[PDB]
Amino acid sequence: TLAVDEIIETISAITPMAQKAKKYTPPAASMQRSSNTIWMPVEQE
């Protein structure tokens, strides 16, 4: 057997939502003590 050096490509996916999603990296040292959670305020009325 000499598996030819060509590949039959089958799948081609796209990730538009994950690309458009904004990505956030809070401080790791603080998050470890805060249990991987962080609070953010809300616009005041």
């Binding site: 057997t1 000499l2 598996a3 030819v4 050096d5």
Partner: protein, 152 residues
Amino acid sequence: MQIKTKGDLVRAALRKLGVASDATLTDVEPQSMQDAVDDLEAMMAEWYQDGKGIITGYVFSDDENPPAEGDDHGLRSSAVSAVFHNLACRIAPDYALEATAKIIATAKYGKELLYKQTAISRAKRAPYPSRMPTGSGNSFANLNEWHYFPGE
């Protein structure tokens, strides 16, 4: 062939030994016949080491069918002589006998001739090692990038 059963093989071996045949005035008992069939079965199981021994097409009788004698042996027509000569050689001690020189020589020759074709088939050369290059002369192998032989 006139010899088509385990009982036929046993009777042929007995005739070769000169103990019992179709012309004698004394015969061997059916218990002796059955137990000689048992000896033949043990011989064939020993020869055919569960697929790694001498392949002859012999068919082993099952216990569901009671009489082992009366079962077609399944051997080809060229194996019968070797089979029954060796059977005579192995069951000669039952009757305080010793197989004659002609029977011994024929048994040896028949066993060798039985294994000849299997030996020819099994004389196979190993594949290339996984550490040898295929060489540049194989353009297709080089382009498909098979620089070294697969192996195994």
